[PDB]
């Protein structure tokens, strides 16, 4: 479940169990964050995922499947 304002700029939703929030100025995603602490996580892995998630809005669907399928393999 996700929350949207009248302009759909702020958003926050759970992919599997972690809070990920996005800020979009326009169609391109300009910011990423991960707001959950699973007790197996390293800070290096945090940076390499948000940077990847940065990009357009249309490739978010393919990237969410690609990035979050490697974690549970």
């Amino acid at each position: 479940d996700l929350d949207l304002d009248l302009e759909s700029s702020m958003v926050s939703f759970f992919v599997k169990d972690i809070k990920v929030e996005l800020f979009v100025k326009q169609n391109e995603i300009v910011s990423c964050s991960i707001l959950d602490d699973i007790h197996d996580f390293s800070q290096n892995n945090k940076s390499k995922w948000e940077i990847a998630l940065l990009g357009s809005l249309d490739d978010l669907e393919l990237k969410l499947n690609h990035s979050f399928a490697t974690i549970f393999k």
Binding site: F23, V30, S31, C32, S33, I34, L35, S47, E50, L54
Partner: protein
């Protein structure tokens, strides 16, 4: 810190009470009865208005004033000294790094952040100067990367339309 409690202990009991008790005890030990038990009946009559609490509270006040000018002067001599220029003239993401836990990393900040970073014992000077050089060079490489990728995407659309 409340230095007033410590100073009040020093001038209330450590200084005045000690001298009063020592005077009484030692002059009593000097003996016989009459000489010491009378010679102190005229010390009250001529040291009066010197142990009133209000004016020795003022004594702490004027020692506080002396503290005021000495503290003013040595306050300056320590606080014109600045090691590195203060917080108000630096990048926001730079606080996000130095204080840690940024929770959000992007490219837009860091691009303009390194653009507006000013160049400045030769150890850190040289390494910081060349590292700032390297990073501004890297970000301008990134934006020319936008140039290349955008051109390639448009041309790919052209060639794909022809071939399809």
């Amino acid at each position: 810190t409340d230095t007033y409690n410590s100073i009040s202990n020093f001038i209330e009991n450590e200084l005045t009470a000690l001298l009063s008790s020592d005077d009484y005890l030692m002059d009593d030990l000097a003996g016989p009865n009459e000489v010491c038990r009378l010679l102190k009946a005229q010390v009250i009559e001529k040291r009066k208005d010197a142990m009133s609490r209000g004016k020795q509270d003022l004594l702490s006040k004027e020692i506080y004033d002396n503290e005021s000018e000495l503290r003013a002067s040595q306050s300056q001599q320590i606080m014109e000294l600045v090691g590195d220029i203060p917080k108000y003239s630096l990048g926001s993401e730079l606080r996000n790094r130095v204080e840690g836990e940024p929770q959000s990393t992007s490219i837009e900040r860091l691009i303009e952040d390194v653009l507006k970073l000013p160049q400045m014992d030769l150890k850190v000077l040289s390494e910081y100067s060349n590292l700032r050089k390297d990073l501004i060079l890297k970000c301008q490489a990134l934006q020319i990367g936008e140039s290349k990728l955008s051109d390639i995407l448009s041309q790919t659309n052209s060639i794909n339309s022809l071939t399809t």
